[PDB]
């Protein structure tokens, strides 16, 4: 019987769903995979619980803090470009923006980092899908907008990237550029098929980034950057918590043994909490 992938109708969701689908068929010759369109990720998980679906593809940023009984995140694929992208028709990068320029972003994480470096900037809300966001930019509603580099590259929109904002300039959200896969824990047929898609290097990084995030707070509603490289077998984790208006920014660093990756994040988060990260709310 065909393996079903629960996915939204959005271009990004459809791409990620097809990515795993193709990856599955490449690793397992003769395997049948099909996509089930749906309609707040709860609806996706219910379908898997109701046996209307097998696995679901998520961006690691959008993976919830709590998994319903019977489910969980068992796989993390090879990571794409983790950092933010600067998108403007009239400008190249951040420092080329005039004082009081209008930069659309709905992300508390991206906003707090911009106001920190340049408080002068006027930050306006940005909503809609990827195409809708670009549509507003061409309408002159913004001087510039900031989108994830991964999303644009996967949509072949890569020409819309004027400059790559480095992790130093803007710290990526937890698991940004990383694609995770969720399924039924006790489904061994699926667990065994999703095993080759798992990237060990990427896995330890994101699972380290998560533990840091989880300790502080959940979801994307909170202005928290979480990003980790790995140098050889050593994991370098950087975390960020700050005021949305760019008042104060609390940064931290730690360097890992590869095995303690989950323990690193929870310790660094506790380290920041003692440094005033708790008072930020």
Ligand X SMILES: *Cc1[nH]c(Cc2[nH]cc(CCC(=O)O)c2CC(=O)O)c(CCC(=O)O)c1CC(=O)O
Residues assigned a catalytic role: 62
Q: 37 is in the binding site of which of Mg ion, ligand X, none (Cβ under 5 to 8 A by kind)?
A: none
Residue 102 token pair: 């209008």
Q: Which does 240 bind (CB under 5 to 8 A by kind): ligand X, Mg ion, none?
A: none
Q: Which does residue 61 bind out of Mg ion, ligand X, none, counting CB within 5 to 8 angstroms by kind?
A: ligand X
Residue 10 touches which of ligand X, Mg ion, none (CB < 5 to 8 A by kind)?
Mg ion
Q: Binding residue for ligand X (CB under 6 A) from 88, 107, 170, 202?
A: 107
Told to check if 10 binds Mg ion by CB under 5 A, we report yes
User: Tokens at residue 153, please?
Assistant: 């590259």
By CB under 5 A, is residue 87 in contact with Mg ion?
no
**β 55-59/179-184 pair status:** antiparallel
Count of chain residues binding ligand X (CB under 6 A)? 16
Candidates 167, 177, 180, 246; binder of ligand X (CB under 6 A) is 177
Q: What is the spatial distance between Cα 70 and Cα 62, in angstroms, rounded to a whole number?
A: 19
By beta-carbon proximity to Mg ion, the closer residue of 157 and 203 is: 157
Compute the least distance from the CB of residue 127 to Mg ion, in Å.
12
Site for ligand X in 25-84 (CB under 6 A): 59, 61-62
How many residues belong to the site for Mg ion (CB under 5 A)? 5
Binding segment toward ligand X, per CB under 6 A, in 88-96, 146-154, 156-164, 263-271: 146-154
In angstroms, the CA 234 to CA 257 distance is 5
Residue 87, Cβ neighbours under 10 Å: how many? Answer: 23
Inter-CA distances, 251 with 34, 121, 239, 273, Å: 44, 22, 6, 11
From 45-53, 143-151, 157-165, 240-248, span contacting ligand X (CB under 6 A): 143-151
């Amino acid at each position: 019987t065909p393996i079903r992938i629960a996915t939204r109708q959005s271009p990004l969701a459809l791409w990620q769903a097809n990515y795993v689908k193709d990856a599955l068929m490449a690793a397992h010759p003769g395997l049948q995979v099909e996509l089930v369109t749906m309609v707040f990720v709860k609806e996706l998980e219910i379908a898997m619980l109701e046996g209307r679906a097998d696995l679901a593809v998520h961006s690691m940023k959008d993976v919830p803090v709590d998994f319903p009984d019977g489910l969980g995140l068992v796989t993390i694929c090879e990571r794409e470009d983790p950092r933010d992208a600067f998108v403007s028709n009239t400008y190249a990068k951040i420092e080329d923006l005039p004082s009081g320029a209008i930069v659309g972003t709905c992300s508390l994480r991206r906003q707090c980092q911009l106001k920190a470096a340049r408080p002068d900037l006027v930050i306006k809300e940005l909503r809609g899908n990827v195409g809708t966001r670009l549509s507003k930019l061409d309408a002159g509603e913004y001087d510039a907008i900031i989108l994830a580099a991964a999303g644009l590259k996967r949509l072949e929109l890569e020409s819309r990237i004027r400059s790559f904002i480095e992790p130093e300039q803007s710290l990526p959200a937890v698991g940004q550029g990383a694609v995770g896969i969720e399924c039924r824990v006790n489904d061994q047929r699926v667990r065994a098929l999703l095993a080759p898609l798992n990237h060990a290097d990427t896995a330890d990084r994101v699972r380290c980034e998560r533990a840091m995030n989880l300790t502080l707070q959940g979801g994307c509603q909170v202005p928290i950057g979480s990003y980790a490289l790995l140098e050889g077998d050593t994991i370098w984790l950087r975390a960020l918590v700050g005021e949305p208006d760019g008042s104060q920014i609390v940064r931290g660093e730690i360097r890992g043994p590869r095995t303690q990756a989950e323990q690193l994040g929870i310790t660094l988060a506790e380290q920041l909490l003692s440094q005033g990260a708790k008072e930020i709310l």
